[PDB]
């Protein structure tokens, strides 16, 4: 860690807890970055030297991480439970996450009293949450040029291997439809 | 002024997505608000002059990473 | 092909079909049922919300720089806490497309080309497009790829995102145990 | 627990222990042949027509010298040939392209670009075949 | 010599720094705390209240902050860091003085002194409250069920606190309600929800399945007394070498004691809290179940908790071998009630009962202990809380808050005493002020905005108000819903002041061996 070393146990006394558990968080924030989705590059995982795994998902690697850091403990579980919740954010918590205890804990120290803080990084969420739903811009299958046929396609044509997309513009509906 | 500057400053952001026409944080008054109502006076030439200087001053150097030196 | 099915024609308690992939051999066919899967599941993710959201962060470096001019809206604190996330949803995308090694840089110049003041607006339609394709690392026009994830899987992460931050707070009296 | 390692680093060490394989079979290949002497720690004379064969003998690292067996062996298991000559490619290859390539920084047209040469490599050969 | 001032000095700072590190209090400050230990151990560790006691130091005034951390918690149980927090408040000036030219006597009386003085001005910021008062009952435990584990289910718990004190209270500006007479019980299965204020008599026992009575009519436990059957307390002299002769001594020794546990149910006993204790085998496994043929509720191995309160509520004392039968030293019971929600956890409930015009006791239930635990250590510091305004009537500025008003005050009576431990009042008086800003201490980054405030902000406000350090917003520290009555903050300041007053004795070097 950081700070006094001779008290163990996430007393660095000070915020060298803090920015160890801060720069852990970036640190374990840095794992899945490179394993961000398909793009991010799959890690190969040394589980002993005899043992090892191929994964870029973010609440893979994490379930298999060690973390006694709190904000090290934080992140994992985030990007399990998120997992946990769908698997979408297994990755995707991770980034800002390492961020927001970083970005949280400065101004509720600040205190006018730490009360103020904590909306800000819901209050922005909660406009996100809005944001989030006021969206049916983009990702809506059911409103396609084709519809559910182009659904199938676009949806398709985004892994193509092939003819993907002209046979299977159809299947996709057919298999939902069967 | 004794106060926070962030805060303040983030206030005066705030306070000039309200006001904005000379507000700011003057030691003047030890306050934030309008600085030329605050008596807060200076000819805007300096400004130009300052702002000649600020961005240029900077981009000398940083258009060289390699400098060399000579004892000659 | 040398793959036999019993075809049941006109099932009469209720309709169905069996497709057959054809492969020229057997993997081809995943290549395809791996395509039709997600394609199948975010039509199915279409099936479990009418709000849906692009995939790929043009939604956060959306909301990027407008919650982060939302930071000096309230001002104070606030500008600081508000800044902190909102600052935030630049940095996903600056993963995104950099595993796609796009340099997200270029993408968030693309991304807020976007993102304006006159376009503040996931609205439903695009008069900027909020997709970004995760397949590429730059945007594209589709939105029925198999990409994108709907409304559920991200107002959770939204959580999540704040998650870490005031989770490790509300602890009192740092100590050290012998 | 809690470590990071990156990228090209790791991308190396993916290189390290392949440019190693990928020499001596590849004397060992061909009508110009050679062997792969093993040294026991007593001494003992070792040599083969197979590196994986002097690997399965001698320390074996976690990166490709772990791999170039495995994917040797997935090259043995399949037509039964070329594992000699997979473990000479791939290391080869890797130690080849990856630095002229990050250098212009991407795995990126390097990830299309093995496909790629394998497209033309596949296209004329069962022409010319 | 100099053995005397290092070690003195180091009372002052292997304590000091324990009690610096103690306050990030009130809420959302700092990071989490997973502890490896001293031995390596990792522990999570949160809401530093508890944590005080949960902290493992040596040292001898560093251990001693420990022992004195449980000090605000024993007699109160509210605001429990109120004295560790200003367990280096005094440490503060400690130094100082020392330094002075101020003799570790006159800095002696200078904790007296200032902790007379000090606990004088919190009266006059203490606002009397209704001593019975369901609000300063229920308020008093929904502030500090508020803070305290629980802040829904303290609209269960602040109500069953206010009836459990209500049911014991002798209302008064003294003690009253103690913390051995509300009996506190908990009980797995039901809910916080289902956690259930009873007034009558509850004891928690371990009680065999099912079968049993939840019904009427029954003679209490807590009874010692074994069952005498041949291979128990009879002499057999059948030998025991072949198997069958060793076959022959259980059937005599099981077949007898039924007519035991009949003699038992005949004396009117649906219950029995047997001795921890073997007279023999005391009540053997073939009593026990033989006991419980008879519906009558057998604990072998009783908690100390059931035995005691059933000699202080229902009046109860062991009864002899029932061939003997029994004196009836058990005291009245009428029913016995073993809840089974869902079947989950054994709770013998003794409605109507000899009782000592007290001893409430609350079942506190829950999905699990935890959950259990989440109302129980609530409850009890409701309980407490509410004991406090029982014990002092009043409500004060919560979280260290009022020392502050404290402080200038006292700064005042720096003057006024005009004497050479004024100018230690008055190190002292200062260093006060240190809790709030201290408060924020953890959490964060760009520091120094929380700090010269939260001084002026009882300065600014005269020796009247300034923020709420566990609200927040400019207003009186004294009124917010943080309160607490008038002991916890007295209580705080009188007991470092004896703790530290001792490290002025703490001299040379000496050591048990």
Redesign the interface.
């Known amino acids: 860690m950081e700070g006094p070393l001779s008290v163990f146990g996430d007393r660095s006394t000070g915020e060298t807890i803090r920015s160890q558990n801060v720069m852990a968080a970036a640190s374990i924030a840095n794992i899945v970055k490179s394993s961000l989705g398909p793009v991010g590059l799959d890690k190969m995982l040394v589980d002993d030297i005899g043992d090892v795994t191929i994964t870029n998902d973010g609440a893979t690697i994490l379930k298999l991480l060690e973390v006694e850091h709190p904000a090290a403990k934080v992140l994992c579980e985030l990007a399990d439970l998120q997992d946990k919740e769908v698997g979408d954010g297994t990755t995707s918590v991770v980034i800002i996450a390492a961020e927001l205890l970083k970005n949280a804990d400065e101004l509720v120290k600040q205190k006018i009293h730490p009360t103020s803080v904590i909306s800000g990084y819901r209050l922005a969420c909660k406009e996100a949450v809005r944001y989030i739903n006021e969206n049916l811009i983009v990702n809506t299958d059911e409103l396609g040029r084709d519809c559910l046929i182009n659904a199938a396609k676009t949806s398709m044509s985004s892994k193509i291997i092939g003819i993907n997309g002209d046979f299977f513009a159809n299947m996709v509906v057919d298999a939902v439809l069967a | 002024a004794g106060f926070d500057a962030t805060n303040i400053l983030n206030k005066l952001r705030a306070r000039h997505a309200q006001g904005g026409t000379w507000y700011g944080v003057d030691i003047n008054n030890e306050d934030i608000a309008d600085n030329f109502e605050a008596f807060v006076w200076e000819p805007a030439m300096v400004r130009i002059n300052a702002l000649t200087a600020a961005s240029e001053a900077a981009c000398l150097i940083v258009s060289v990473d390699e400098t060399i030196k000579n004892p000659r | 092909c040398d793959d036999e099915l019993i075809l049941i024609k006109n099932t009469k308690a209720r309709?169905?079909?069996?497709?057959i992939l054809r492969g020229a051999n057997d993997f081809?066919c995943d290549?395809?049922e791996?395509?039709?899967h997600?394609?199948?599941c975010?039509?199915?993710?279409?099936?479990e919300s009418?709000?849906?959201?692009?995939?790929g962060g043009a939604?956060?470096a959306?909301?990027s720089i407008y919650?982060e001019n939302?930071?000096?809206?309230?001002?104070?604190?606030?500008?600081?806490?508000?800044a902190?996330?909102?600052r935030?949803?630049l940095?996903?995308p600056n993963?995104?497309?950099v595993?796609?090694?796009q340099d997200s840089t270029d993408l968030v110049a693309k991304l807020r080309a976007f993102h304006n003041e006159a376009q503040v607006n996931?609205?439903?339609?695009?008069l900027k497009?909020?997709?970004l394709?995760?397949?590429n690392?730059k945007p594209r026009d589709?939105?029925?790829?198999?990409?994108?994830?709907?409304?559920?899987?991200?107002?959770?992460?939204?959580?999540?995102?704040?998650?870490?931050?005031?989770?490790?707070?509300?602890?009192?009296?740092?100590?050290?145990?012998? | 627990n809690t470590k990071r390692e990156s990228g090209r680093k790791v991308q190396s060490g993916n290189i390290n222990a392949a440019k190693t394989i990928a020499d001596i079979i590849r004397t060992c290949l061909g009508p110009k042949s050679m062997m792969k002497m093993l040294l026991d720690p007593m001494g003992g004379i070792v040599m083969t027509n197979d590196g994986n064969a002097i690997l399965r003998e001698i320390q074996v690292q976690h990166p490709a010298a772990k791999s170039m067996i495995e994917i040797s062996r997935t090259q043995d298991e399949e037509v039964g040939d070329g594992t000699t000559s997979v473990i000479i490619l791939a290391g080869e290859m890797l130690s080849v392209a990856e630095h002229f390539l990050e250098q212009q920084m991407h795995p990126t047209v390097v990830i299309s670009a093995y496909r790629k040469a394998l497209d033309d490599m596949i296209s004329t050969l069962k022409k010319i075949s | 010599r100099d053995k005397p001032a290092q070690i003195r000095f180091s009372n002052i700072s292997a304590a000091k720094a324990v009690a610096d590190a103690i306050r990030t209090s009130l809420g959302p400050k700092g990071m989490d705390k997973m502890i490896q230990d001293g031995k390596g151990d990792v522990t999570i560790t949160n809401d530093g209240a508890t944590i005080l006691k949960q902290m493992q130091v040596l040292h001898p005034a560093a251990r001693m902050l420990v022992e004195l951390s449980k000090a605000q918690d024993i007699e109160a149980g509210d605001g429990t860091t109120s004295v560790v927090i200003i367990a280096g408040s005094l440490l503060d000036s400690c130094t100082k003085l020392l330094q002075k030219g101020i003799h570790p006597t006159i800095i002696s009386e200078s904790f007296q002194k200032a902790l007379e003085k000090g606990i004088e001005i919190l009266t006059d910021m203490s606002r009397p409250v209704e001593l019975s008062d369901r609000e300063t009952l229920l308020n008093s435990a929904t502030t500090s069920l508020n803070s305290k584990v629980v802040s829904q289910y303290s609209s269960l718990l602040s109500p069953m606190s206010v009836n459990a004190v209500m049911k014991v209270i002798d209302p008064a500006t003294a003690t009253s309600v103690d913390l051995r007479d509300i009996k506190i019980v908990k009980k797995l299965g039901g809910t916080i929800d289902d956690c259930e204020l009873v007034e009558g008599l509850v004891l928690t026992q371990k009680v065999s399945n099912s079968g049993i009575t939840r019904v009427e009519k029954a003679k209490i436990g807590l009874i010692q007394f074994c069952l005498s059957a041949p291979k128990t307390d009879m002499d057999n002299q059948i030998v025991v070498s072949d198997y069958a002769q060793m076959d022959r001594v259980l059937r005599e020794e099981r077949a007898y004691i039924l007519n035991l546990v009949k003699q038992i149910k005949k004396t009117g006993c649906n219950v029995l809290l047997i001795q921890k204790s073997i007279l023999r085998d005391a009540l053997s496994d073939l009593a026990l179940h033989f006991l419980n043929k008879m519906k009558i509720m057998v604990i072998k191995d009783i908690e100390r908790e059931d035995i005691e309160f059933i000699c202080k509520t229902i009046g109860t004392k062991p009864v002899a071998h029932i061939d003997q039968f029994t004196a009836d030293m058990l005291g009245s019971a009428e029913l016995a009630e073993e809840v089974n929600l869902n079947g989950s956890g054994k709770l013998l409930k003794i409605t109507g009962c000899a009782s000592p015009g007290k001893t409430v006791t609350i079942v506190v239930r829950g999905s699990n202990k935890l959950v259990i635990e989440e109302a129980e250590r609530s409850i009890h510091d409701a309980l407490c809380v509410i004991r406090c305004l029982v014990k002092k009537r009043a409500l004060i500025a919560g979280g260290g808050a009022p020392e502050i008003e404290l402080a200038l005050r006292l700064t005042e009576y720096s003057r006024t005493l005009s004497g050479m431990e004024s100018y230690c009042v008055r190190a002292f008086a200062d260093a006060m002020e240190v809790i709030p800003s201290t408060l924020a201490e953890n959490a964060g980054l760009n520091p120094i905005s929380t700090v010269t405030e939260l001084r002026n902000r009882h300065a600014q406000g005269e020796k009247t108000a300034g923020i709420n350090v566990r609200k927040g917003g400019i207003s009186n520290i004294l009124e917010e819903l943080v309160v607490q009555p008038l002991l916890v903050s007295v209580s705080a300041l009188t007991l470092a002041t004896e703790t530290v007053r001792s490290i002025l004795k703490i001299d040379d070097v000496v050591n048990t061996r």
């Open positions: 309709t169905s079909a069996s497709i081809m290549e395809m791996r395509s039709l997600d394609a199948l975010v039509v199915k993710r279409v099936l009418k709000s849906v959201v692009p995939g939604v956060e959306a909301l919650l939302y930071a000096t809206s309230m001002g104070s604190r606030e500008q600081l806490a508000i902190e996330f909102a935030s949803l940095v996903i993963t995104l497309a595993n796609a090694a996931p609205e439903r339609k695009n497009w909020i997709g394709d995760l397949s690392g589709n939105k029925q790829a198999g990409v994108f994830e709907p409304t559920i899987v991200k107002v959770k992460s939204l959580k999540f995102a704040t998650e870490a931050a005031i989770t490790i707070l509300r602890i009192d009296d740092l100590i050290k145990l012998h």
